[PDB]
């Protein structure tokens, strides 16, 4: 097998201004290699093949060299529409082998996310079980540490997050924390923290309540 | 024009088999080379196969001698993939794509066009409704401004549950998370901000349906006394 790497994994950037990833083979390719773009709810796209050629019906700002070992892609203008992940495939022998991606994301402001923590539900205590949940919302870059304190304990078990991608409205990132417990092991214990440490601010954002309150 | 249209989702268990399929239509069926591509959560696509529709022919990967057998029906223009002794690691999205050239002896080329992808669940467990449970404010807590009203929706399985907010009506503002695995069952949240004269003084509403379960639920979010 061939070994496709593509460097950045990460990339972000504005309308207008011009991008160019990496593609690099663990052997020669001789000039053999593609690009496709993948977007949500729509088919895997053809952009470029051969190293440099541009497919049919493909705008003329996606453009692509190399040769042997190392290739690249670079789009021209960015245009809102070229926000996507990019995959590189080689086709210069059996077995047809491609790189891992490149998500290519939209930059904007900074922006603190908006901290909210909630309680056990009482339906979910009456049967048993205790999920503390903790929203963190509207926030750029996507890069962020979140904390579970119990009664200022930092607590790793039970805790499962979920991102969204970048939004469609004003490109920001949102995450939900949720620490899991007996309901058992819940009672025992009486201030709950959830804390969000982001670019955005040196001093984390603390948000916690008391079980009695 | 030329489409790929690929099956609907399977759920197997362990050990089982699967067999999906990829309709061609608008161009000449026997002519190109197509070929299976296999796509598991952040790990890149994998090439499985491709067989030759005009002569019956196929390649695999080394990597899934054993897992797939590659097949076409020519009078349908269909393809048709079938994996065997099925895994967690079998787990994926799968795709058929159409060579972009016609021919047999440019197996390894590129592809022009992509079907939809068929997705694959491998798992053991059972189909439970889920459990949803209102998210409201610390007691007391309309802080400044706005307000953050969640919705959770706990252990069900397969995918998917679809959430609204009040019938749909309410729409911005809304963060619905993708859901995660917990052992065997999947589990999502959603949020709604919005402004704290809205509530508690108008009634906001959940909206949970479970398709596998035939589930319809609706959560008011009630202030936390």
């Known amino acids: 097998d061939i070994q496709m790497t593509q460097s950045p994994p990460y990339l972000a950037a504005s309308p207008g201004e011009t991008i160019t990833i990496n593609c690099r083979a663990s052997?020669?390719?001789?000039?053999?290699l593609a690009w496709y773009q993948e977007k949500p709810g729509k088919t895997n796209k053809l952009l470029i093949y051969s190293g440099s050629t541009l497919q049919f019906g493909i705008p003329s700002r996606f453009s692509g060299s190399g040769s042997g070992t190392e290739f690249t892609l670079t789009i021209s203008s960015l245009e809102p529409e070229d926000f996507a992940m990019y995959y590189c495939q080689q086709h210069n022998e059996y077995p047809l082998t491609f790189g891992a991606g490149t998500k290519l994301e939209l930059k904007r402001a900074d922006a603190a996310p908006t901290v909210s923590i909630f309680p056990p539900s009482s339906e979910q205590l009456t049967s048993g079980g205790a999920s503390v949940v903790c929203f963190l919302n509207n926030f750029y870059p996507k890069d962020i540490n979140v904390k579970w304190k119990i009664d200022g304990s930092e607590r790793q078990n039970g805790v499962l997050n979920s991102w969204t991608d970048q939004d469609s409205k004003d490109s920001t990132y949102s995450m939900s924390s949720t620490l899991t417990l007996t309901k058992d092991e819940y009672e025992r214990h009486n201030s709950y923290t959830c804390e969000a440490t982001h670019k955005t601010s040196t001093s984390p954002i603390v948000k916690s309540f008391n079980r009695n309150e | 024009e030329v489409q790929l249209q690929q099956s609907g989702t399977v759920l197997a268990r362990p050990g089982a088999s699967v067999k999906m399929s990829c309709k061609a239509s608008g161009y000449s069926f026997t002519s190109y080379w197509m070929h299976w591509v296999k796509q598991r959560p952040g790990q890149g696509l994998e090439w499985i196969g491709a067989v030759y529709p005009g002569n019956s022919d196929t390649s695999y990967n080394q990597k899934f001698k054993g897992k797939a057998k590659l097949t076409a029906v020519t009078s349908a223009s269909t393809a048709y993939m079938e994996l065997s002794s099925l895994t967690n690691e079998d787990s994926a999205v799968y795709y058929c794509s159409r060579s972009s050239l016609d021919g047999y002896y440019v197996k390894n080329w590129c592809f022009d066009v992509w079907g939809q992808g068929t997705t694959v669940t491998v798992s053991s467990a059972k189909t439970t409704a889920p459990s949803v449970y209102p998210l409201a404010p610390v007691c007391g807590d309309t802080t400044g401004s706005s307000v953050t009203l969640g919705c959770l929706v706990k252990g069900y399985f397969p995918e998917p549950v679809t959430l609204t907010w009040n019938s749909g009506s309410l729409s911005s503002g809304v963060h619905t998370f993708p859901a995660v695995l917990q052992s065997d069952l999947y589990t999502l949240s959603s949020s709604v901000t919005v402004t704290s004269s809205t509530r508690p003084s108008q009634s906001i509403t959940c909206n949970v349906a479970h398709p596998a379960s035939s589930t319809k639920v609706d959560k008011k979010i009630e202030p936390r006394g």
């Open positions: 052997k020669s390719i001789r000039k053999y």
